[PDB]
Amino acid sequence: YFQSNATIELSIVIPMYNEEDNLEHLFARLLEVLTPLKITYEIICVNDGSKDKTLKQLIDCYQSNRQIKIVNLSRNFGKEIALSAGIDYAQGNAVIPIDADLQDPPELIHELVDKWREGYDIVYATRRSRQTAKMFYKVIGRMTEIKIPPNTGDFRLMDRKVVNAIKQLPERTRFMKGLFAWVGYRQTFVLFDREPRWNYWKLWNFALDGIFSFSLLPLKVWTYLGSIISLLSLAYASFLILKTITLGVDVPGYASLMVAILFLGGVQLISLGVIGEYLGRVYEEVKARPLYLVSDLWGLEYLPLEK
Amino acid sequence: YFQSNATIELSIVIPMYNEEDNLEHLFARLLEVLTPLKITYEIICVNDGSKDKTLKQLIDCYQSNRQIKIVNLSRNFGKEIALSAGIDYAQGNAVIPIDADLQDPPELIHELVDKWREGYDIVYATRRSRQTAKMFYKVIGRMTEIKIPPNTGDFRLMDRKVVNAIKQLPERTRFMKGLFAWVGYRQTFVLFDREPRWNYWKLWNFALDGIFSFSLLPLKVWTYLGSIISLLSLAYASFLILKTITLGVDVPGYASLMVAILFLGGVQLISLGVIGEYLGRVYEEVKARPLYLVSDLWGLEYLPLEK
Amino acid sequence: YFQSNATIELSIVIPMYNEEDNLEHLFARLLEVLTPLKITYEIICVNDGSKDKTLKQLIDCYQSNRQIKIVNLSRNFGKEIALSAGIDYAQGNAVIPIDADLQDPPELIHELVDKWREGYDIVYATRRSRQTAKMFYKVIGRMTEIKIPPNTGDFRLMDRKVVNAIKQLPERTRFMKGLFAWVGYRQTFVLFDREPRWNYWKLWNFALDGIFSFSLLPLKVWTYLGSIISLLSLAYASFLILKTITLGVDVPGYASLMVAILFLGGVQLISLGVIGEYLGRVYEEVKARPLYLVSDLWGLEYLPLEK
Amino acid sequence: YFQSNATIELSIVIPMYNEEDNLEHLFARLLEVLTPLKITYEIICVNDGSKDKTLKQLIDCYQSNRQIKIVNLSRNFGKEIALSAGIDYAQGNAVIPIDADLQDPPELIHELVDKWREGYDIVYATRRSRQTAKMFYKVIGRMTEIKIPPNTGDFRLMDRKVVNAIKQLPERTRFMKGLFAWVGYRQTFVLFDREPRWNYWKLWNFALDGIFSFSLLPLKVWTYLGSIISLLSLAYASFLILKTITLGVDVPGYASLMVAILFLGGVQLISLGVIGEYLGRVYEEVKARPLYLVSDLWGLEYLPLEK
Amino acid sequence: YFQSNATIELSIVIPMYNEEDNLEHLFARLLEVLTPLKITYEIICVNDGSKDKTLKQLIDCYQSNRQIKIVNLSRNFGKEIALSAGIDYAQGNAVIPIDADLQDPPELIHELVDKWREGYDIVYATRRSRQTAKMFYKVIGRMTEIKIPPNTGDFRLMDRKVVNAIKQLPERTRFMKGLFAWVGYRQTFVLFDREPRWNYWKLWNFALDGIFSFSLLPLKVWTYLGSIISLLSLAYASFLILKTITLGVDVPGYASLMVAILFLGGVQLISLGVIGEYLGRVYEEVKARPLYLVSDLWGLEYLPLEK
Amino acid sequence: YFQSNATIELSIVIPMYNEEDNLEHLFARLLEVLTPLKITYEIICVNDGSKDKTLKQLIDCYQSNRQIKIVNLSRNFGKEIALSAGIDYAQGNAVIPIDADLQDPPELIHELVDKWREGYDIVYATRRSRQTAKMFYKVIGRMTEIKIPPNTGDFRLMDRKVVNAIKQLPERTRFMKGLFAWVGYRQTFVLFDREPRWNYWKLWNFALDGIFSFSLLPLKVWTYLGSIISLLSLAYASFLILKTITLGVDVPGYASLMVAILFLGGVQLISLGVIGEYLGRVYEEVKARPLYLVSDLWGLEYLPLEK
C-alpha cells in the first residue's frame, strides 16, 4: 500500500546566481509540471557564489521539500561550470538542465520525457525557426548525420548512458559545440515557440572549435604542407648556390642574401614540422576522450573503464 | 559424462556494417570450419552503426546460438575501431579477427590453431606472393629480426599474452604498422593463395609512421643538427660584424641586413631546438607503451601492472 | 573523568634547517601559547638535510613530548618543499605553518584560531602597513574579489577543506602567488605589527606567474594575433607578386626578396599558431587543477574524487 | 633447530645475453662469495632474447637451485632495460646489479654489504684511479654535495628505500647520469683495482642530459632572453619606421626590408617564447618525479603514494 | 620453445614421521613413475613432529628439487591430521595422498590419472579381494548407490571440485567413513593386488559413525519413542491412582510407590524428549556441511560460498 | 646516522589495578633492565577499573615516554582478562607478561630474550624447587612430552607465532592449564629463586579442566558405558518379565516394581546416551580451536585462516 523506492527517475539541474525572490515561483511552476508525471525526481540546485541571500532561502526550501538538494560552490565559477557540477552530483535515469528564469517553458519536460520513453537517448528542445550554404558547410563538416536545427538546444534531456560516457571529458562543459556530434547516440528534437524573440561569429566559432577539438587533420595537413614548401625552398636555394658560380654575379649581395634566407626558412620549417608531428603524438597520448562508445551488449557485461 | 567448462579457447571477432543478408552464410561457413576443431569458442560480432537491418538478424542469431555475442557501438566508427572494440570484449586464449565477407578462407583457422599449438604467440596468414632494395631498407629500419613477407597479414592469431600486452596502447588499432615489430614475441606465418587477385605510397607511409611512433631519433638528430647550424650562422654573423668595421663598407645595406638575418635565424633555431628537446622529454613522460615486455617467469609471479 | 580523543584540532608545521640551539626556546614559546587554547594539537617538524646536529635534539624532544612529530627528508630540498611535505603529513582540522625563528609572534595563533571559529576557511596574518595604480591593476587582474593587503601573509591558517582541495596541485608549494585567489573560499585577515622592519620586481613576478598559471588567454590571444598578422603579410606578398609583373621592375632584387621573406614569415607564423593551439589543448588535457570546488552540500554526499 | 624465513636479505640481478657456457663458473664464484655471508639471498637472471641456448641451461640451473629465478623478456631489449626489469622483479632489502662476465670481482659484495650495515643507503664500487677544472665544473653543476669519483660506479648496492623511491621514474634506467645526485640519500663508495685497464664526449653528455632532465632553467632563461631580444628588435624596427619618413630615403629598398625582417623576427620570437613557457608548464604537469623524498619518520606512518 | 606454466596438474601428499633413511628411495620411485606422465606436479611433504633427523634431509631434498614442498607442524598430531594439512596446502587439479612406505605401488598413479582423464571425480585404488548379508546391510544403510568394495581405498584421487566441496567440513579428516557416500560425485575404482597380505568391529564402527554423522533420524525416532512410552506410563499411573480408591488397598505401599515411580519416569522422559528435540535443532543450526552440492552449471556462474 | 624503525621487538604487558604510588619504581626498574638490551620495545599498561588515581599518573607517564601505552577497560574485569586485553593490543615479536609488583625479578627478561634468540618459541621462568606418582600421572595425562616443572610459570615469553595461533581461542585466558601442552611448539624454561617463599586442590583442578577441555573421551566412554549398562538392565527386565509367568509369583509387588524400575532406567539411559552423542558432535562443530598448527613452511605461503 505504501512502498519506498530509492531510485530517481529524473534529475532537474538549476544553476542559481542571485536568484533571490524568484525561488518560490520557480519551484511552484516546477512542481506544477512535475507532479502530473507521476515519476520520482530530484531538483539539484547549484549556487555559484551568489551575493544576495539566495542560499538562506535555498536552505529554507530544502527543509520543507525532500526533492530539493543544494550544491554550494567555493566561489563564482561560470554558469556552465555550475551546470557541470550539478550534473556531476545528479543521480537519475535522465538529466534535464533547467534555466532558472524559465525562458523556456517547463511544460516541455513532458514532451522530453515522452520522447525519452520511446528510446531516444538525447532529446533537444529547439526553437521553431527562431528569428543557405553555411548549413550545408556545417553538415559536411560534422561528418556524422545530424538533423537538429543549428540552434540545436541547450534545454535538453540526456540519458544516464550519455552522461556516464562524457563524465570524464573536458568538453562536457561545452557539450553543444561538437561533442554532441561525436557521441552519436540515438538523438531527436522537440519543436517549440518562445513568446519573446543570429550571430555569424558565434556560428563560426563553434565550427572553429570543433575542427580542432575532434580532429588532428589541420595539424597533420599543415605539417606536410610546410614540409613540401621547405623542400621546394631548399631546392631553390641549392639551385641558386649552383647559380652565380657557373653564371655571372650581376647582383652582388642579392644572391647570397636569398640563399641565406631560403636556407634558414627551410631549416626552421622542417623544425616546426617535426615539432608539430611530435606534439600531435603527445596529444593522442594525453587525450581523455575514448576511442569508441558502446550502446548495447548482448551476451556480454560492460567493461569497468574506471578504477 | 556431461561436464561444463567456463573457459573459451578461441575468440572470433567479426566487425559488421550493412552485412544484412550475408549473416546466414557467414555463420554456416564459420561453424562448418570450427566444429571439427573440437574446442570451445565464441564469436564476437561488432555492429558499428549499420543502416540496414543487420542488428535485428544479429539478435535473431544470438537467440538460437550460445556462442554468438554482439557489441553495439553508439555510432559508425571505423572498422579498425570496431575490431579494437571486439578484441577488447573478447575472452579467449587466442583471438582471431575475421573479415565478414570471407575473402580469406575460414579454413585457414585450422592452420592458425595448429601453429598456435606449437608454441607461436602470433601467427600471420600471408598471401603466397600476391600480385628489391626497399625490402632490405624496411628490414634494416625494423631493427628487429622479422621474416614475414611485406603484406604480412591482417588475418592472424594473437595469444592472450600479446593482447594483454597491447590492450592499453594507442597503436593497438594500427597493430601492423610497426607495433608487431616492437612486441617481438615468438611469431610465424602461414602461406595461402586467394582466387581473386602493390601501392608504393602505402609501403612508405607505414615506414614513415613507424620511424616516428617508436623512436625519438628524428627529433633528437634534427635538434642537434639545427643547433650546430645555428651556431655556425651565429659565428658567421659575428665574423661579419667584425668585418665592415676593420674593412670597407662597400655594400651599404647588405652587411647589416645579413647580420640581422643571421642573428635572427640563429636565435630562432636555438629556441626551436630547446623546445624540441623539452617536447621530446614530455613525450617520454606521457608515453603509454612500456619499457619492456616479459614472455615467461621461473620462480616468480607476474607484477600487477594494473589497478 | 579521563577520556581519550584521537582527533587533532590543529597542526603546526615548522620546517627546520640548522635550527640547532633554538629548539628549546621555540618549543617553550609554542607551548606557552598553545596550552591556554585548551585544544588538541600536534607539531610537525620537517628536517631538510641539516648539517649541524638538529635531528638528534629533535629526537630528544620527540621522546619527552607526545605532540612532536618529525619528518626527515632525504636531502636538502627548498623550505617551501619542506612546508609542503609537512602539510602533506599533517592531520588536523586547521593547519598553521610556523617559521622557526618566530619573527611573527606566536600569539597571533590565538587570533587565527578565533577567526577560524567564526567560519572563515583561510585567515591571513598581514603586517599592519609594513615599510597607487598598481594595487588597482593587481585587483582587476585577479578577476575575483580579494581584499587582503598586497603582502597578504605567509603566516596563515587553512581549513582542512582548503588543504584537501589543493593537495594534488603543483601550485600548492606556491600558494600565495595566485592559487589563493583561485580557490575562492571564505577568507579574512588579521593585522599585526612587527618590531623589526618593497621590491617592485617581486610584486610583478607574482602577477606574471599568475597570468600564465590560471589562464590560457595569453596563448589564445597571441595565436590569433599572429594568425591575422600572417594573413596580412601573405596578402601583401600576393599583392607584391601581382605587382612588378603588370608594373615595372625598377628594383631588381628587392621585390623577389620581399615576397620570399613575407611568404616565409607567413607560413612560419601559421605553423606557430597551429602548434600553439594544439599545445593549449594539451595543457587543458594534462592540467591537475579541477574545474570547480564545492564548499558545502545539502542532501548530498561528497564525490570521492580520489582512488 | 630448523626454522624458515620468507624474507630475502639481498637480491643479485644478472642480465644475460648469449652467456651460454659461462653460467657454471659465474654461479660457482657467486656462491663461493655469497655463502660465507650467512644471509638469505636470491639471484634474478634476466634473459633478453639470447640466440644461443642460454635459457635451457638457465632452467637446468633453476631446477637444482632454489635461489635462482629467471625473467624472460619478449625480445632483445637493451642491457639497461634488462637490469631495470630484474630490479623490478627483485625482492630484497638490498639490490646489487652484477655483470655476467665478472669484470668487477664478486668479492666486493662483502665490502658493499659491510658498508650497507653501517647505515649507508647507496654504496658504489669505484675503480681506484682508473686510467682539473671539469671536475669542479661538474661539482658546481650538481648543486648537491657529491664526493664520489667521476666514474662513480655501475656496480653498486641500493637500499629498498631508494629502489622504491625511483621505481616509477623514467630515469631509473639511467640512474647514474644525475638521478643519483637528485635522490640525495646517505651515500658512500668503496675503492678497488681492476687488473685489465677516458672519453670527454661521454663526460660531457651526462652533464648535458642532467642539465635538462632535472631543471627547467635553460628553457626559462632562453625564453626570457629571446623575449628581450624580440623587444629590442621591435623597438629598433619602430625607430626605423619612424626614420626615413622624417629623414631621407637614401636607401630605396633597404629600410622597408629591414623593418619587415625585424618585425617578423620579433613576432616569431614572441610566439616561440609563449610556446616555450606553456611547454614548460606542461612538463611540470606530466612529470613523474616527485617533489620531495622522505628518509625517516618519527611519530608518523608513511603516506601510501600508490594505488 | 621454452615456456613456463604456473598451474600444477597433480598434487602428491606424503605425511612423514621418522622417515629418515627412506626419503631417497621414496623420491626415486616417485619420480620414476611421475616423469613419464609428462604433467606438472608437486610433492607436498608434511612433517608431524618427527624425532629423528627427517626434516634436515627433507630440506636437503627441497634445495635440489623445485617440485618438493614441506609443511612442518608444531607438534605430532595424527597422520590423518597431517594428511588434512597437506591437502589444505596442496594446489593442483587432482590430489593423491601417498603413503610414505609405498605399500601400495606408485605405478597405480598412472591408472588413477587415466581414469581421472575420462571424467571421474573420485577414483579409488581397491585391493583385489584382500584376505554376505552385512554387505547388503551396509548398502541399504548407505541410501545412495555406491559400488566400491568394502575396503574402498585410502589410496585415491580426488578432483579439485571434491576437495573444494569438503575443505571446511570436520569429516574431511575421516573422508572414508561416510562422507564419500554423501558427496555423491562421479566415482569409480581401480583394482590391484598387494604382495604382502578383516575386523568386524572396524566394519561396524564406520557404520555406527555414519548413522549419526549424516542423519538426525536416531535422535528423532528415539525422542518420539520415549514420548509415547512416557505417555503410556503416565496413563497407567493415572489408572492406578484411579485404582485403590474405588477398589481395595490390599497392597499397602506397592500402589503409591508404583504411581510415584511411573509419574517420575514419565516426567523425566518428557524432559529428555524436549531436550533432545531442541538439541537436534541446535545441531541443524551449527552444522557446517551444506544442504546440496553443485556438479556443473550451464549459463550461470558459481556462487561465492566463502568470504 | 639517525634512522627510524617502526617494528617493535618486544612487548611488556602489565595489568594494573590500584598501582598508584608504585608506577615510578616499576618503570625505573623496567627501564634499568630493558635499555641494556639495545632492542626496540613497548610497555602496554592495562587499567581494569582502578579506584585510586592510577590512570592520571599513567597518563602523566605516557606524556613523557614514547614506549608507554595505556589500555583502559570499561570496568574491573579479572586480572587474567586484563592480561588477555593487553596481549591483544600488543605488537611485537615477543610478548612478556609482567606482574606489577615485580615479585619475579625483571632481570629474568634478559635470560628469556637470550633463550628466545636461540630458537625457542615459548620460554618459562620457573621457580627453582619452590617450597611422587602425581607428577607421573600428570605426565601420562598430558599425552605430549612436556618437561617443565609443575609450577611451570606465569612469567614467560611467547613468540608472535604462538600468540597468533591462540588469539581467537577461549582458553587463551587460561593458557597454562593445558593449552600450553596442546600448542606443542619449541619450548624451554629458565630456573630462578625467589627470596620470599603447594595446594593439591589446585594441582588437581587444572588436570580436571584439561581432561575436558581438550578431549571428548570422557563423554564418549561414559555414553558407551551407560549404553551397555542400559542394555544389561533391559535384558534383566526382559528375563524377569519372562519369570513369574512360567514360575511362581511369591513376591506380589516386587517383580512388577523391579521390571518397571529397570525398564524406565534403561530407556532414560538410552536417551541420555543419544543426547550425549549428539552434544559431542555439536561440540566438535562449534569448537574454535583448530585441527593442527603449522610451525614452518618451505616452498609455500601461509594460508589466510582469517577474514
Swiss-Prot record, chains A, B, C, D, E, F:
UniProt entry tagged with the keyword Transmembrane helix: yes
Bilayer topology annotation: Multi-pass membrane protein
GO molecular function (one): glycosyltransferase activity
Enzyme Commission code: 2.4.-.-
Pfam families: Glycos_transf_2
Transcription keyword on record: no
Record GO cellular component, one term: plasma membrane
Localisation per UniProt entry: Cell membrane
Residue intervals passing through the bilayer: 221-241, 255-275
Keywords from the named record: Cell membrane, Glycosyltransferase, Membrane, Transferase, Transmembrane, Transmembrane helix
Family the entry assigns: Belongs to the glycosyltransferase 2 family. GtrB subfamily.
Descriptive protein name: Uncharacterized glycosyltransferase sll0501
